[PDB]
Amino acid sequence: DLICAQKFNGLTVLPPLLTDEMIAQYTSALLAGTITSGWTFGAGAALQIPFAMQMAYRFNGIGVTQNVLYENQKLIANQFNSAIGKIQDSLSST
């Protein structure tokens, strides 16, 4: 294979410093702080904030007044989840 053939002649594949399991801890952290702490963990100590009260800001960011989310929350929930599902098959089927 390419596993040792290259490695015959002095073509070596050095291990990436960060194991994949570590990469998955970062992308857990970044994803753990994004969910709980909003965006503040990039600017300093993470600040726990209710996730539904996070998304009220991220609408103010795009100009949609937060009263949309507090009223549409249940709907927005399903649209989110059903959107995540198709990401599987988008990857899974192609």
Added chain:
Amino acid sequence: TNLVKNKCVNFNFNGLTGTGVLTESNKKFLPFQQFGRDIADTTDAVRDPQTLEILDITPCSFGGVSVITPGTNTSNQVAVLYQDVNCTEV
């Protein structure tokens, strides 16, 4: 000359020459064949002429020595890393 198994050996089989680590291998040759080969046109696996058996060829391991040291300021002590070997050939 007597065959060497699980030990770095120079070799010649039927005029084919190289240097590797000869092992028992389960890849299965059709009768008339001689060599095996890998993707890279290396000689990967050969069959012992006198006693038909499928012998891998893995050339003896090698790797970059890496000298791990704190600054020579703090110490003269080094910890050497032999890259990508089993720990025997030390």
